[PDB]
Amino acid sequence: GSSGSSGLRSVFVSGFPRGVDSAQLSEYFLAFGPVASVVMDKDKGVFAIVEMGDVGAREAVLSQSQHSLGGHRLRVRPREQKEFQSPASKSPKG
Numbered sequence: 001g002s003s004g005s006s007g008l009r010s011v012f013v014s015g016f017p018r019g020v021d022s023a024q025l026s027e028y029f030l031a032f033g034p035v036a037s038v039v040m041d042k043d044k045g046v047f048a049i050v051e052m053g054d055v056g057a058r059e060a061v062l063s064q065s066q067h068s069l070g071g072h073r074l075r076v077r078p079r080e081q082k083e084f085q086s087p088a089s090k091s092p093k094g
Helices: 022-031 055-062
Strands: 010-014 035-040 047-052
Touching (some): 022 035, 022 047, 047 055
Antiparallel strands (some): 010 047, 035 047
8 A cells, every 4th residue: 555565576667769678678777676577568569567576676666766768758657557446444343
């Protein structure tokens, strides 16, 4: 929920310009931690699933001020999609 939650050691990166490759991206994401790989769509090439070695690594990215890939801006996100929302109300009994 709140800041700091182990479970997803990956991040969703997109919004990159034309020319960017998987190898490059990874290298750029190595300044924070060890990247497993970059699964970028080949059919079209719009989004890329950036994987990380350990949970900490992925966390080091979330705790970053601003991200950029050689000037251009990147919409780096903690792979937070299709998030189910609902009024979770409940209280414990003495």
